[PDB]
């Protein structure tokens, strides 16, 4: 109870970090001005599943120079299946389109779909090369599922920073890294995400149309990265949130991310 009350009472990111005895990295980015507010914006955190947003972007980018790549069918083998494979588990022994694998990995965070897409694009090195070409010198993809979700202090594999990921979401989901139809498809997948109802979305008011991608690991990490489109029109905002908080429960980590959303909504005003 005391921890829950301290989380609810926190009105700024530093106080919220203290309330959960964690390490919290947040960037709130105004795309009209480039202005950012946050906490630990340039510290490294494990991407965990949040990298899947950029794996899908790498696929879409490759499809712009490989006609019909999105329609290519990829076998789903029994040996490819992992514990978290909510969509691909139904297709073991048959195949799925690249496009449907992308959707599955964004909106359900399907780990098998991510590994199959890694095989399509050329692995973590291809995702990192896409990130670098897009202008992100910080974020890096190094490993496959599920090993990529590990984190060690000082080990930069599969990490980002809140500010690097916020800028990348702007360039890729809103900017000109991808062709318009490609970026719109990616935006739609993020808008359709099914795993974030208790995270940033739970703290953001109805004035925002939200697209997001979550992530977590079993030790202490819980993340959510989001694009906020004002339903009334105007410039979008980007909100990234990376948390490590081993002293609280998985469900309390969601509460922290929801509180990030409530604080951010108030700061936008
Ligand atoms: C991604 O971080 N993961 C995939 C899956 N879904 O969780 S998410 O919805 O938060 O992404 C299980 C947890 C995690 C993982 N360990 O792979």
CA dihedral 101, 189, 255, 239 (to 10 degrees): 120
Question: Cα separation of 91 and 80, whole Å?
Answer: 11
User: How close is the Cα of 101 to the center of ligand 1, in Å?
Assistant: 16
Q: Are strands 23-30 and 237-244 parallel, antiparallel or unpaired?
A: antiparallel
Which residue has the CA at smallest separation from atom 16 of ligand 1?
Answer: 217
| Ligand 1 pocket, residue 141 CB under 6 Å | no
CATH of domain 1-269: 3.40.710.10
The whole-angstrom distance between residue 245's C-alpha and the CA centroid of its chain comes to 18
Question: Cα separation of 37 and 33, whole Å?
Answer: 12
Whether residue 49 lies in the annotated active site: yes
Domain ranges of the chain: 1-269
Please name the residues in contact with 171: beta carbons below 8 A apart, sequence gap of 6 or more.
Answer: 134, 135, 136, 177
Technique that determined the structure:
X-ray
CB-facing half-sphere around the CA of 93: CA atoms within 13 A: 1
| Phi and psi based region of residue 179 (left: phi greater than 0; alpha: psi -120 to 50; beta: remaining) | beta
Nearest CA to 257 out of 215, 217, 194 is that of: 215
Question: Cα separation of 43 and 244, whole Å?
Answer: 12
Shortest-distance atom of ligand 1 to CA 196: 9
| Ligand 1 pocket, residue 216 CB under 6 Å | yes
């Amino acid at each position: 109870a005391p921890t829950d009350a301290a989380i609810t009472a926190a009105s700024d990111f530093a106080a919220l970090e203290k309330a959960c005895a964690g390490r919290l990295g947040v960037t709130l980015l105004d795309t009209a001005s480039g202005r950012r507010i946050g906490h630990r914006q340039d510290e490294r955190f494990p991407m965990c599943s949040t990298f899947k947003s950029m794996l899908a972007a790498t696929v879409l980018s490759q499809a712009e120079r490989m006609p019909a790549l999105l329609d290519r069918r990829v076998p789903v083998g029994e040996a490819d299946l992992l514990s978290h494979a909510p969509v691909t588990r139904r297709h073991a022994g048959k195949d799925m389109t690249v496009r449907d694998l992308c959707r599955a990995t964004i909106i359900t965070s399907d780990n098998t779909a991510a590994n199959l897409l890694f095989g399509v694009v050329g692995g973590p090195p291809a995702v990192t090369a896409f990130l670098r070409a897009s202008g992100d010198t910080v974020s890096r993809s190094d490993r496959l599922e599920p090993e990529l979700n590990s984190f060690a202090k000082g080990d930069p594999r599969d990490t980002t920073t809140p500010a690097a990921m916020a800028a990348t979401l702007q360039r890729v989901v809103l900017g000109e890294v991808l062709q318009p139809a490609s970026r719109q498809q990616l935006a739609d997948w993020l808008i359709d995400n099914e795993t974030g109802d208790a995270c940033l979305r739970a703290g953001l008011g109805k004035r925002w149309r939200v697209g997001d991608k979550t992530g977590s690991n079993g030790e202490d990490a819980r993340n959510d990265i989001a694009v906020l489109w004002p339903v009334a029109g105007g410039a979008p905002w980007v909100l990234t949130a990376y948390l490590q908080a081993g002293a609280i429960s998985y469900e309390q980590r969601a509460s922290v991310l929801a509180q990030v959303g409530r604080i951010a909504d108030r700061l936008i005003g």
